[PDB]
Design an enzyme around this catalytic site. Structure first.
Site, PDB file in Angstrom:
ATOM      1  N   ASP A  68       0.829  -1.230   0.000  1.00 22.49           N
ATOM      2  CA  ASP A  68       0.000   0.000   0.000  1.00 22.49           C
ATOM      3  C   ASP A  68       0.848   1.258   0.000  1.00 22.49           C
ATOM      4  O   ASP A  68       0.353   2.332  -0.346  1.00 22.49           O
ATOM      5  CB  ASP A  68      -1.018  -0.005   1.156  1.00 22.49           C
ATOM      6  CG  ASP A  68      -2.328  -0.577   0.624  1.00 22.49           C
ATOM      7  OD1 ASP A  68      -2.442  -0.929  -0.597  1.00 22.49           O
ATOM      8  OD2 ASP A  68      -3.310  -0.781   1.307  1.00 22.49           O
TER       9      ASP A  68
ATOM     10  N   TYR B 240      -0.778  -0.569   9.646  1.00 20.39           N
ATOM     11  CA  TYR B 240       0.153  -1.636  10.041  1.00 20.39           C
ATOM     12  C   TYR B 240       1.190  -1.115  11.038  1.00 20.39           C
ATOM     13  O   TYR B 240       1.560  -1.848  11.965  1.00 20.39           O
ATOM     14  CB  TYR B 240       0.854  -2.231   8.799  1.00 20.39           C
ATOM     15  CG  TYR B 240      -0.200  -2.876   7.899  1.00 20.39           C
ATOM     16  CD1 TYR B 240      -0.822  -4.052   8.337  1.00 20.39           C
ATOM     17  CD2 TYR B 240      -0.567  -2.336   6.687  1.00 20.39           C
ATOM     18  CE1 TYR B 240      -1.789  -4.685   7.583  1.00 20.39           C
ATOM     19  CE2 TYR B 240      -1.541  -2.961   5.919  1.00 20.39           C
ATOM     20  CZ  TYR B 240      -2.134  -4.121   6.381  1.00 20.39           C
ATOM     21  OH  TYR B 240      -3.087  -4.762   5.619  1.00 20.39           O
TER      22      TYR B 240
ATOM     23  N   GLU C 265      -4.419  -5.386  -5.951  1.00 18.33           N
ATOM     24  CA  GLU C 265      -5.439  -5.264  -4.925  1.00 18.33           C
ATOM     25  C   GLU C 265      -6.153  -6.578  -4.685  1.00 18.33           C
ATOM     26  O   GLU C 265      -6.253  -7.053  -3.537  1.00 18.33           O
ATOM     27  CB  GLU C 265      -6.442  -4.186  -5.362  1.00 18.33           C
ATOM     28  CG  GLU C 265      -5.723  -2.829  -5.367  1.00 18.33           C
ATOM     29  CD  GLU C 265      -6.581  -1.601  -5.319  1.00 18.33           C
ATOM     30  OE1 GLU C 265      -6.442  -0.697  -4.457  1.00 18.33           O
ATOM     31  OE2 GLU C 265      -7.458  -1.485  -6.230  1.00 18.33           O
TER      32      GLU C 265
ATOM     33  N   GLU D  88     -10.604  -2.281   0.041  1.00 17.98           N
ATOM     34  CA  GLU D  88      -9.978  -2.986  -1.071  1.00 17.98           C
ATOM     35  C   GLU D  88     -11.009  -3.641  -2.005  1.00 17.98           C
ATOM     36  O   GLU D  88     -10.802  -3.719  -3.213  1.00 17.98           O
ATOM     37  CB  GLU D  88      -9.023  -4.055  -0.529  1.00 17.98           C
ATOM     38  CG  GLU D  88      -8.045  -4.569  -1.557  1.00 17.98           C
ATOM     39  CD  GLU D  88      -7.000  -3.549  -2.004  1.00 17.98           C
ATOM     40  OE1 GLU D  88      -7.336  -2.495  -2.613  1.00 17.98           O
ATOM     41  OE2 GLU D  88      -5.793  -3.827  -1.750  1.00 17.98           O
TER      42      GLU D  88
ATOM     43  N   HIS E 245     -12.079  -0.862  -4.284  1.00 14.27           N
ATOM     44  CA  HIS E 245     -10.998  -0.439  -5.188  1.00 14.27           C
ATOM     45  C   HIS E 245     -10.869  -1.403  -6.371  1.00 14.27           C
ATOM     46  O   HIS E 245     -10.781  -1.012  -7.536  1.00 14.27           O
ATOM     47  CB  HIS E 245      -9.639  -0.374  -4.494  1.00 14.27           C
ATOM     48  CG  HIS E 245      -9.610   0.620  -3.366  1.00 14.27           C
ATOM     49  ND1 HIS E 245      -8.512   0.686  -2.512  1.00 14.27           N
ATOM     50  CD2 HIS E 245     -10.466   1.585  -2.951  1.00 14.27           C
ATOM     51  CE1 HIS E 245      -8.757   1.656  -1.633  1.00 14.27           C
ATOM     52  NE2 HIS E 245      -9.917   2.232  -1.856  1.00 14.27           N
TER      53      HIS E 245
END
Ligand SMILES: [Mn+3]
Ligand SMILES: [Mn+3]
Ligand SMILES: [Mn+3]
Ligand SMILES: [Mn+3]
Lengths: 296, 296
Positions: B76, B114, B167, B201, B204
């Site tokens: 990402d 994260y 993705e 996601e 997307h």
């Protein structure tokens, strides 16, 4: 053999993941936190409560509103889809890159907000007329292409100057009209959207100006004065163009002289964000008190 | 007044402002509304509540967590600062460009998430070890650089294939570990961050895949078969690389066989998002029910 072989052969350094546990510049995190914590969307403001006052505004007042706001829409269309994006390849830190992605998104929110106002208040011909006007207006197209020529160029520090002048001078000068009308009890809910935009723009111009200052200070004293001369020449060019734009937008309403004081106020603030003293003596920047207090 | 007169002759069309009163593709507005309505920040989730659960995880479970999530961070970082941005100049509508500024921002949110998990749960050496590991791991560097080769190229449709495979195939496959752990009642607050990422996601990959399908439909049959062959070759290449990555990450834990089923599941979904049938028979995609459901 693969289509990507030559790319990989020419890109031997590792691709890096952003690590927020190590922050070379604390300001990147401060600004990320501030901007993301200030997220908003125009639907949270009840612009429909402005229908009564809009309908009571004069034709000249409504025309100025449509044109000022379409000009602002244009600037933030550019700033979200070209300007902020153009700053990413030159970032000092990966955290700064992440901040530019927030700025690009919020500029899209800003731009959308003007359509939310239009769609609530204005007529279909009024909206179409304004967008076609914005595409043919010479002063608006000129300021846009001047700024974009730096975004599309190869000098990273000039991109940051152009951005800061767009945010702290061009866009800020457009806030005159909503603030004026709100101090007269008109379009008061629209002014609340504008205040959310101002809350973002204030931070954008400070932050990109800060990054410009940090970059130019890495240069020789001679190179720094060359960038300062560039900045003052571009500022004065944009100011002269903005004077003409201002006369054309506001002369019929009679607001021009105060808006021109506001232009000089904002020109000095934009230069300050870039680490420079102002081009105008302070006593030439006396915009009416309401305007300033209406900003927040 | 000089620096930009060649710029203008190279740029004679008007600069346009986005107008949300006229929407050539209603999907652009639907996706704008969905994604912006789903805005979130990782601080919304109490990841510190996972500290005891983390502390009870084995060294092998912790290592896998650090490695999978750092590789997702890399993906990402790429998607937010390079990928989504690469799609803007090819957009069919200005509203689509606005959507990509939101996606770029939210990929930075995903990446930062994260770090929020790591900074809350992991030790400082664990974090440093993981970022250095990610810079040297040959399969993670290879998948990154293959995708970046398309972002950096000149073929708009290949950028959208690359993005959708990133993705819908690469990123989605990384969701196995948090979903497994959560199904075993471990790192359940961390899994709520991951579910917010999945919520984004999913949209997307649908949307960029949609735009790919619309673009390749405009091409001759011959050219459409060429793009389909390109897509299948790149998918199987990334798949083989991902098999090796998966063996290395999951063999010690013993999750590899079910993760490989999930790889094929996600490969078929990524191809479906691009308008194509799957490379794997459906019976080769039976990832364990627990994972599918905790996903959602
Ligand atoms: Mn703005
Ligand atoms: Mn701004
Ligand atoms: Mn993501
Ligand atoms: Mn994504």
């Amino acid at each position: 053999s693969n289509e990507y072989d030559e790319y990989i052969a020419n890109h031997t350094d590792p691709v890096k993941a952003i690590n927020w546990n190590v922050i070379p510049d604390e300001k990147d995190l401060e600004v990320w936190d501030r901007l993301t914590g200030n997220f908003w969307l125009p639907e949270k403001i009840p612009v429909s409560n402005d229908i009564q006052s809009w309908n009571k505004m004069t034709p000249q007042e409504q025309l100025a509103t449509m044109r000022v706001f379409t000009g602002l829409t244009l600037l933030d269309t550019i700033q979200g889809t070209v300007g902020a994006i153009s700053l990413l390849p030159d970032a000092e830190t990966m955290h700064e890159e992440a901040v530019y992605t927030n700025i690009a998104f919020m500029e899209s929110v800003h731009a959308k907000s003007y359509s939310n106002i239009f769609m609530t208040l204005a007529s279909t011909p009024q909206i179409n007329e304004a967008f076609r006007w914005s595409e043919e207006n010479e002063n608006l197209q000129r300021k846009a292409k001047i700024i974009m020529s730096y975004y599309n160029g190869d000098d990273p520090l000039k991109k940051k100057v152009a951005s800061t002048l767009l945010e702290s001078f061009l866009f800020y000068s457009g806030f005159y009209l909503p603030m004026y009308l709100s101090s007269r009890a008109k379009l008061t809910n629209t002014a609340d959207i504008i205040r959310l935009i101002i809350r973002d723009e204030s931070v954008h111009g400070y932050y990109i100006g800060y990054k410009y200052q940090q970059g130019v200070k890495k240069l020789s004293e001679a190179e720094q004065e060359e960038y300062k001369a560039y900045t003052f020449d571009l500022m004065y060019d944009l100011y002269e163009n903005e004077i003409e734009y201002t006369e054309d937008i506001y002369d019929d309403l009679g607001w021009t002289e105060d808006v021109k004081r506001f232009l000089r106020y904002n020109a000095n603030k934009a230069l300050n964000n870039l680490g420079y003293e102002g081009l105008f003596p302070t006593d030439e920047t006396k915009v009416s008190p309401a305007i300033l207090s209406s900003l927040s």
